[PDB]
Every structure is written in C-alpha cells, then in structure tokens.
A paper describes a structure:
The cage has octahedral symmetry, with external and internal diameters of 12 nm and 8 nm, respectively. Homopolymeric Fts constituted by human H chains (hHFt) are considered very promising nanosystems for drug delivery.
With the aim to verify if the developed disassembly/reassembly protocol can be used also to encapsulate peptides within the hHFt nanocage, [name] and hHFt previously disassembled in SDS were mixed at a molar ratio of 1/1 peptide/protein subunit, as described in detail in the experimental section. Finally, to obtain a structural description of the [name]-hHFt system, crystals were grown, and X-ray diffraction data were collected. The structure of [name]-hHFt was solved and refined up to Rfactor and Rfree values of 0.171 and 0.223. Also in this case, the protein cage is perfectly reconstituted upon the encapsulation protocol and the peptide is not visible in the electron density map. The spectra show that [name]-hHFt possesses the same secondary structure of the untreated hHFt, thus indicating a correct protein refolding.
Author numbering: 3 to 176
The structure:
Amino acid sequence: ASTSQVRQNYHQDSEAAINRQINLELYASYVYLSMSYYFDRDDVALKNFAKYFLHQSHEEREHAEKLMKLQNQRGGRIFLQDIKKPDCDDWESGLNAMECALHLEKNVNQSLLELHKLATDKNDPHLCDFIETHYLNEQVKAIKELGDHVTNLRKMGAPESGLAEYLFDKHTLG
Ligand SMILES: [Cl-]
Ligand SMILES: [Cl-]
Ligand SMILES: [Cl-]
Ligand SMILES: [Cl-]
Ligand SMILES: [Cl-]
Ligand SMILES: [Fe+3]
Ligand SMILES: [Fe+3]
Ligand SMILES: [Mg+2]
Ligand SMILES: [Mg+2]
Ligand SMILES: [Mg+2]
Ligand SMILES: [Mg+2]
Ligand SMILES: [Mg+2]
Ligand SMILES: [Mg+2]
C-alpha cells in the first residue's frame, strides 16, 4: 500500500489496462509464431509466409516489451497472466492465415482504442501520446497491409489455386 516515487497522474485503471494490453501483445506474438511454423511444414512449404509471420511474431514481442517499459516508467507494477495458445491449430491456407492475422490486428487495435478512451477519461495526456505514437498508426498500417494481402490472394484465386499462394509467396512476401 506504499506508492512509487516516480508515479504521477497514473490511474490504477490505466495500470490494469496496460497489464491486459501486455498479455494481448504476447498472445499476438504467440499466434504469429504458430502461423509461422505452419508454413514451415513439409506439406505447406511456403518459406516466405513462414518468414513473414515470424517477423510479425518478433514485432509483437517488441510491442509487449515497450508496454512493460512504460508500466515501469509511470511507476505502475507489471502483472503477467498465462499466454493462451492460439485459437487455430490448423490454418488450412495462406489466405486463411492472413484473414486470421487481419482479425487479430483488428482485435489488438480495438483493445488499444479502448485503452486510449480510458487514458482520455483519466486525463492522462502522456499515456494518450504514448499509445498514438507507438501503437495506433502501427496498427492502421498493419491492418491495411493484411487487407492488401488478403485482397491479392482472393483476386489471384486462393485458396483453391495452390499456384496463387506459391506466386504470392515469391512476389509479395519475397
Ligand atoms: Cl498517480
Ligand atoms: Cl488511482
Ligand atoms: Cl494467469
Ligand atoms: Cl503512415
Ligand atoms: Cl520474378
Ligand atoms: Fe501489437
Ligand atoms: Fe514470376
Ligand atoms: Mg525447413
Ligand atoms: Mg505487425
Ligand atoms: Mg485454455
Ligand atoms: Mg490528443
Ligand atoms: Mg501527440
Ligand atoms: Mg514522442
């Protein structure tokens, strides 16, 4: 029940919301790791899908670490939960994995916008600027890129066309 010497204008609800955001960023990292190694399978074998999702996985881990840094910067206390296994074992195709990534990045975005509404209600301009600076445009860019990718795969004839996924792997992701 004693307070951080650095803590100023940092609401307990914001502190809680940051810890929930940290768990969601580590979850995203885990989903992207899972997708990566699906495409490394001998019966899928799209090495540039695998490389693309592994890079996304490492990105999500940096998102988590920056939130852990912020928690400490503001004098909050990190509280960790189980990282849940990803919601798909089989991802069936390039298109389907990109579709799942798009839904994930939209879920992560919806959580960040909720976090921003809270920071606004608690009048925390530093936490607002942090979220705007480091997260909101990264999400908008990521969602747009996955949108683009999903559209290319669909137009090329995925997931029926194994040729479309092969060529997309070489031209877009290579
Ligand atoms: Cl405070
Ligand atoms: Cl408080
Ligand atoms: Cl837990
Ligand atoms: Cl931009
Ligand atoms: Cl070429
Ligand atoms: Fe993220
Ligand atoms: Fe070609
Ligand atoms: Mg291999
Ligand atoms: Mg990303
Ligand atoms: Mg479970
Ligand atoms: Mg503002
Ligand atoms: Mg600003
Ligand atoms: Mg700045």
